[PDB]
Amino acid sequence: GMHTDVNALFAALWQDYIKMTPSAAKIHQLLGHGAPIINDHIALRTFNIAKVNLSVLAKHFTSIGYVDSGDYKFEQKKLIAKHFEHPDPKQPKVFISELLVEEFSPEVQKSIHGLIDQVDIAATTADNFIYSGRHWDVDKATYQALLAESEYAAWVAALGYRANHFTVSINDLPEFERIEDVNQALKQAGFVLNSSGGEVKGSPEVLLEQSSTMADKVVVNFTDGDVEIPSCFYEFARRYPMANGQLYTGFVAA
Ligand code: NI
């Protein structure tokens, strides 16, 4: 059955995540000097297939005190999502999204169903489910067909059930005030940041600023090949107070 302790769950999720994301292990040490770092959030992904849907993943958190705190729809990416909050403010928010499989070609829908058909339903209630990885055989052509319509779908097909990212709470870092200053320390320590949308996405005026490392790389063992792909980035977020004084809790620019 599922974890009973919130600290143990995140410990196990992080141990799994850093295997894909060595940069996160290094930056965690850099910023915290060996102390634990407060996280703003983690992000998990799935498909809207009953066996593995948003609600199934969410039970791993609502069973140990998380509360449903926000509903989101992302139209362009064909996603719905929710975030969950724990009564202890040291604990990360939990962001869980699911791809709407019906929005894709019949061929992609069949392929995605084919992967999830291989998931043992019993695995979905075990304690390791959210960091259990791949439960399916998948070949390169299947990966490419998914990738042609959805990077999200391809990522889930390649890596399975594992954290997509952890996000450091800049608010809570005792030595830093500004995301720009965290970004500068990261570059000075020899990490490279994603600079596509600009190195900082958002602004104080939209109540949220985020930045990230460039994704590390991992080898995925497809049925017909061993392919190197991007795994995960490590993210950084500063939140700002709304009109009423509480921090903005959303996940894109307000
Ligand atoms: Ni995030």
From TrEMBL:
Keyword hit for Transmembrane helix: no
Entry cofactors: Fe(2+)
Keyword match Amino-acid biosynthesis: no
Stored SMART domains: DUF1338
Enzyme class, first EC level, given as a word: oxidoreductase
Keywords: Dioxygenase, Iron, Oxidoreductase
A Pfam short name: HGLS
Domain of life: Bacteria
EC numbers, comma separated: 1.13.11.93
Molecular-function annotations in GO: dioxygenase activity
CDD domains with a match to the protein in the record: VOC_like
Similarity comment: Belongs to the 2-oxoadipate dioxygenase/decarboxylase family.
Official protein name in the record: 2-oxoadipate dioxygenase/decarboxylase
Lineage: Bacteria, Pseudomonadati, Pseudomonadota, Gammaproteobacteria, Alteromonadales
